Design a protein around this ligand. Structure first.
Ligand SMILES: Nc1ncnc2c1ncn2[C@@H]1O[C@H](COP(=O)(O)OP(=O)(O)OP(=O)(O)O)[C@@H](O)[C@H]1O
Ligand SMILES: Nc1ncnc2c1ncn2[C@@H]1O[C@H](COP(=O)(O)OP(=O)(O)O)[C@@H](O)[C@H]1O
Ligand SMILES: [Mg+2]
Ligand SMILES: [Mg+2]
Lengths: 501, 466, 187
């Protein structure tokens, strides 16, 4: 019991007359600094979670109010701050600029541009600490969100408003699923049907700065930076800037959801956020738990991933889809953090590090990948064909010269090689449904397994040209009728007679 | 009495009074907010100062704000008018259908029933699931646990028990969602409307709903299991009826007490929990009892963190249960749903007097052939199958069909695989485990026993793979 | 913040933080002797059974223990900066440690003219010529123009010698010259 503000520099202000030329209601000093937080004396009208401003130009959040002092969490570095400064009160809860006028920029976590293109031109500001919608305004998912990947769109289907995990080890193809989702929306954002438009947000937490820069080129090379925002707190940024990065990233997606538009956000990754919240907790001397984590890690990721919801038709009809990324250490799906997020999201996608080495790419574990709520929201053209491939990929997995074994071991390898896909080649929905058709209706059962990657690149390149006007009725009518599948029988069996083995 | 907010640290607000110190567990009202912030007195610190715990977000509190004492604990609307409605932690309607109109109000913190009110009746609650009928049967009027990790089926199973038991029930029902997905709580409200359990035109509804979910502050998840409990005490005491009480998930009541116990200034115990961990669970759990007036049949659902059954939070709730169904993931990898551990599921009514002398003898033969198979897995994995005896190529060849006969296609999982939901009677899950333990079906493969109902469909499946 | 003057002793503790903050405000405005005469009379007017009660009694309040002290220091003699000091001690709950702040301030103000007195602990008191000779050689040792004070204690455990301390110097001529006879043993 010695008091934080029992020091002689504050007793002297009181013992030499109650001084008049100090404000002590909207501005205060800084008593100590260095472990992150600062001990600010004064500021007797500050709110909780209210952004303040230092004399160096740094923003800080008012976290912890006490009868003596205020503890301010400092965004950015804490070398610029000195004991004896003066800190000003802004007068608002921590909020970020948000609007339609951000599509095409690269901001940092506080909402300032770091691409060197001038100011942003925003008019509205939403808080970062808002609550999720309740039980009434939500409704079940019904519109499908295409991926362009032949393994995801037919085996673990996604829908507009469904959380979906992407979990795997290092260098297994995690980010290359998230990039092909953004490039695949080129076909919808440049059309006339406004009800199928979809924007994108990318949040880069703890990555290298030179990997984000080689990523915004790849989006600009494919005309995908005109509907995409990027928030960036890389590995050289301070620890409060990585903790508050997905909150400011999700508050820019909550704008489109409440105003009838559909959004999409990729957190990459939520593992490096929880090692940044661990650092701020133990530097405040809080009791650690399992793996030296604080006790409220579950509050950190649940209050963020509860916002991604779909409103009803009386609230506009928008949505918000999330796709977080978790990195596991040597296949450990039974650790503390990859179980706190499995028990939140509505499914999983598993990336094996020992199928990525055998040459199967993308290395999607089809046995452990599930999507609960998003199965009822997919195209009936896809459900008519991929419902059959779900059966044969199961019968290939039990048998791992006998009768009823060398038949399924023949077909079950031709469907595994049918689900390989090159990088940065997002396919349309109705071009998938012809390639999965040939592998499950029994047409390529005679070919060799090594000459089937050659077969898909030859059949698609011709039916996109000579039967282009006859493929559009799959995408327009949304189904395979009795006239389309009788027509589709002749396209393949005439191509196998011309495909030189 | 009016007070001034002195310190705000997270979700714990400090308040200094000037006259009229309010006693513990009283509710306070903060003056000057758009919504309704209500506190809860938790300690007395001396110098005329209390220390509260807030029931909503404390963003925007100025040191010097005025707070007004209510004079009584948190009282919620209770009665038969709360049926077919949704209530939050402090009993406000969150379903946009108007206010709940009742006549009497009941406090949240009530004491436990005494020693001379405990009834000692034991019965059997037949469900329709083959694993929990045979090896660990359910008693009417007693508590039931459901342990498991993250992703094994603790909610596909608890929505099957609602589909079987609670739909044909004659009494009342209470669901209390503590810390689950808010999109799941929307689906439960929108399935009871189509199936006619909740009705929005007349007054024949049968179930109330209480909800404090995972996006709520820690002060509001630590007190919502007392609210769904106090609703189901009126339907037992002041009406005399047989109720049901589904709570899911009850670990979030324990987790959200450790988040706020660091801010209250305590020394922490083992792996990171609060020191008063087993004092305040026994104070909560000894209010869910079958007394001499009515029967509360609680079906809880407990979470096991990092698949560790020695963690103090799922290892202090084992002293409060009658039945126990320990789910495991290593059975769920093989495709056996529900993935119930047969050798870890216990029961209290398993006794040769109550369930009989024929039920008790087949149920102990199943746990004998599955334990001897478990002692040979260290040898079959190294030296293979061809190193056993000839009589021990029959314990293996029979336990690998009883394991697959403890699989069953559920009714709520029709939208997963597209198979029909099957229900069996209790008298036919005794006959199925006699014609396997005797050796009547030693001419069928193991995969013919996979995902069927009674024993007659097993022979109607082995003719297909001919 | 502004700078503050340093005291020549620089003691530590919760009572040294209040004897330094007053020395940094009374060395300014040249009032170091006015506070000292006031502080040696506020020690008298606290230890009365009407006033020593209900300052350590915890069940009154904070504010009415201020008002029963804000007029008591206003009516009799005081309206300097020191009236804020008693007003600040009663706000922080540190009214119990008020003899600790006062007794620290006297030695902090002593060293402005004081000498950190001596200790001669040998035997029964001797004649006057031995006392005036040590008082006139120790005056040659200070070299600071300050009239030294001194205390004499009686301790018969020392055989025939005397120990003398000058501040923090401590010469020694005592029975430890008998303990230096271990050179006959340890060699
Ligand atoms: N479909 C594919 N076909 C061929 N190669 C691929 C495919 N997908 C990914 N790769 C290769 O995998 C490499 C790493 O992919 P990616 O950057 O997604 O890994 P990562 O898990 O994000 O790595 P980290 O998380 O450690 O940054 C890329 O350089 C790319 O060449
Ligand atoms: N009878 C069953 N048939 C098929 N799948 C099941 C069955 N029971 C559980 N599952 C699977 O197990 C998972 C359990 O998740 P869920 O019950 O929703 O939450 P929890 O993690 O609390 O168990 C589901 O994803 C479901 O796919
Ligand atoms: Mg990456
Ligand atoms: Mg669940």
């Amino acid at each position: 019991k010695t008091g934080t503000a029992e020091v002689s520099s504050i007793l002297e202000e009181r013992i030499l007359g109650a001084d008049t030329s100090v404000d002590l209601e909207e501005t205060g000093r800084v008593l100590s600094i260095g472990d992150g937080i600062a001990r600010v004396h004064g500021l007797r009208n500050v709110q909780a979670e209210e952004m303040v401003e230092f004399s160096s130009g740094l923003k800080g959040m008012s976290l912890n109010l006490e009868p003596d002092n205020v503890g301010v969490v400092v965004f950015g570095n804490d070398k610029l701050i000195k004991e004896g400064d003066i800190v000003k009160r802004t007068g608002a809860i921590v909020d970020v600029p948000v609007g339609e006028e951000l599509l095409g920029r690269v901001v940092d976590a506080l909402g300032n541009a770091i691409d060197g293109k001038g100011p942003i031109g925003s008019k509205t500001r939403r808080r970062v600490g808002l609550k999720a919608p309740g039980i009434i305004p939500r409704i079940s998912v019904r519109e499908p969100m295409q991926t362009g990947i032949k393994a995801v769109d037919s085996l673990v289907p996604i829908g507009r408003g469904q959380r979906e995990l992407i979990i795997g080890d290092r260098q297994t193809g995690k980010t290359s699923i998230a990039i092909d989702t953004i490039i695949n929306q080129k076909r919808f954002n440049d059309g006339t049907d406004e009800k199928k438009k979809l924007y994108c947000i990318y949040v880069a937490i703890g990555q290298k700065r030179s990997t984000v820069a080689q990523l915004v080129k790849r989006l600009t090379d494919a005309d995908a930076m005109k509907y995409t925002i990027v928030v960036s707190a890389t590995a050289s940024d301070a620890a409060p800037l990585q903790y508050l990065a997905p909150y400011s990233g999700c508050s820019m997606g909550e704008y489109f959801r409440d105003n009838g538009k559909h959004a999409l956000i990729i957190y990459d990754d939520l593992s490096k956020q929880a090692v940044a919240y661990r650092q701020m907790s133990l530097l405040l001397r809080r009791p650690p738990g399992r793996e030296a984590y604080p006790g409220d890690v579950f509050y950190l990721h649940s209050r963020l991933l509860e916002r991604a919801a779909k409103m009803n038709d009386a609230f506009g009809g928008g949505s918000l889809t999330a796709l977080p990324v978790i990195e596991t250490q040597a296949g450990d799906v039974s650790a503390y953090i990859p179980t706190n997020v499995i028990s939140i999201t509505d499914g999983q996608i598993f990336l094996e590090t020992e199928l990525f080495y055998k040459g199967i790419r993308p290395a999607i574990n089809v046995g452990l990948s599930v999507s609960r709520v998003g199965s009822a929201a997919q195209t009936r053209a896809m459900k008519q064909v991929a419902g059959t491939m779900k059966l044969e990929l199961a019968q290939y997995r039990e048998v791992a010269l006998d009768a009823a074994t060398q038949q399924l071991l023949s077909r079950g390898v031709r469907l595994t090689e049918l689900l390989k896909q090159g990088q940065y080649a997002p396919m349309a929905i109705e071009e998938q449904v012809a390639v999965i058709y040939a592998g499950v209706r029994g047409y390529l059962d005679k070919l060799e397994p090594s000459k089937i990657t050659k077969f898909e690149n030859a059949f698609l390149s011709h039916v996109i040209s000579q039967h282009q006007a006859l493929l559009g009725k799959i995408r327009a009518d949304g189904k395979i009728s009795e006239e389309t599948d009788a027509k589709l029988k002749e396209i393949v069996t005439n191509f196998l007679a011309g495909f030189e083995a | 009495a009016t007070g001034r907010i002195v310190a705000v640290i997270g979700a714990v607000v400090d308040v200094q009074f000037d006259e009229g110190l309010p006693p513990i567990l009283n509710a306070l009202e903060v003056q000057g907010r758009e919504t309704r912030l209500v506190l809860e007195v938790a300690q007395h610190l001396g110098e005329s100062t209390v220390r509260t715990i807030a029931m909503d977000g404390t963003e925007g509190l100025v040191r010097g704000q005025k707070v007004l004492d209510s004079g009584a604990p948190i009282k919620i609307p209770v009665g038969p008018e709360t049926l077919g409605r949704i209530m939050n932690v402090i009993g406000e309607p969150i379903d946009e259908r108007g206010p709940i109109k009742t006549k009497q109000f009941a406090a949240i913190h009530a004491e436990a029933p005494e020693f001379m009110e405990m009834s000692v009746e034991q019965e059997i609650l037949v469900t329709g699931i083959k694993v929990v009928d045979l090896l660990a049967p359910y008693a009417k009027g007693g508590k039931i646990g459901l342990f498991g990790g993250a992703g094994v089926g603790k909610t596909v199973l608890i929505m099957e028990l609602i589909n079987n038991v609670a739909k044909a029930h004659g009494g009342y029902s209470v669901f209390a969602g503590v810390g689950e997905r808010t999109r799941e709580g929307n689906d439960l409200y929108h399935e009871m409307i189509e199936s006619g359990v909740i009705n929005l035109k007349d007054a024949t509804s049968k179930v109330a709903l209480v909800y404090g979910q995972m996006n709520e502050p820690p002060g509001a998840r630590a007190r919502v299991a007392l609210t769904g409990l106090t609703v189901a005490e009126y339907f037992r005491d002041q009406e005399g009826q047989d109720v049901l009480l589904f709570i899911d998930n009850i670990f979030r009541f324990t987790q959200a007490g450790s988040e706020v116990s660091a801010l209250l200034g305590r020394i922490p115990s083992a792996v990171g929990y609060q020191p008063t961990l087993a004092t305040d669970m026994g104070t909560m759990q000894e209010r869910i009892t079958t007394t001499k007036k009515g029967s509360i049949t609680s079906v809880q659902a407990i979470y096991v963190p990092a698949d560790d059954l020695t963690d103090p939070a799922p290892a202090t709730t084992f002293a409060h249960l009658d039945a126990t169904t320990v789910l495991s993931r290593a059975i769920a990898e093989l495709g056996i749903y529900p993935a119930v551990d047969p050798l870890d599921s216990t029961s209290r009514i398993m006794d040769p007097n109550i369930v009989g002398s024929e039920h008790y003898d087949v149920a102990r033969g199943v746990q004998k052939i599955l334990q001897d198979y478990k002692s040979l897995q260290d040898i079959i994995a190294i030296l293979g199958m061809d190193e056993l005896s000839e009589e021990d190529k029959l314990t293996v060849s029979r336990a690998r069909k009883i394991q697959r006969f403890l699989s069953q296609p559920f009714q709520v999982a029709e939208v997963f695989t597209g198979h029909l939901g099957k229900l069996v009677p209790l008298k036919e899950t005794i006959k199925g485990f006699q014609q396997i333990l005797a050796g009547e079906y030693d001419h069928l493969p193991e995969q013919a026993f996979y995902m069927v109902g009674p024993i007659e469909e097993a022979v109607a499946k082995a003719d297909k793979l001919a | 913040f502004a700078k503050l003057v340093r005291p020549p002793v620089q003691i530590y503790g919760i009572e040294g933080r209040y004897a330094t903050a007053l020395y940094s405000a009374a060395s300014k405005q040249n009032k170091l002797e006015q506070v000292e005469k006031e502080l040696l009379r506020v020690a008298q007017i606290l230890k009365e059974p009407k006033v020593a009660a209900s300052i350590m009694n915890p069940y009154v309040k904070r504010s009415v223990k201020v008002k029963s002290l804000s007029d008591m220091t206003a009516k009799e003699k005081f309206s300097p900066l020191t009236s804020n000091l008693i007003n600040l001690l009663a706000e922080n709950g540190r009214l119990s440690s008020t003899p600790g702040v006062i007794s620290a301030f006297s030695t902090m103000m002593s060293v402005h003219r004081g000498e950190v007195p001596c200790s001669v602990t040998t035997a029964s008191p001797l004649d006057e010529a031995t006392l005036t000779e040590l008082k006139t050689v120790l005056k040659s040792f200070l070299s600071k123009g300050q009239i030294l004070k001194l205390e004499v204690k009686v301790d018969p455990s020392i055989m025939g010698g005397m120990i003398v301390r000058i501040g923090e110097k401590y010469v020694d001529m005592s029975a430890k010259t008998k303990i230096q006879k271990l050179s006959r043993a340890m060699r």
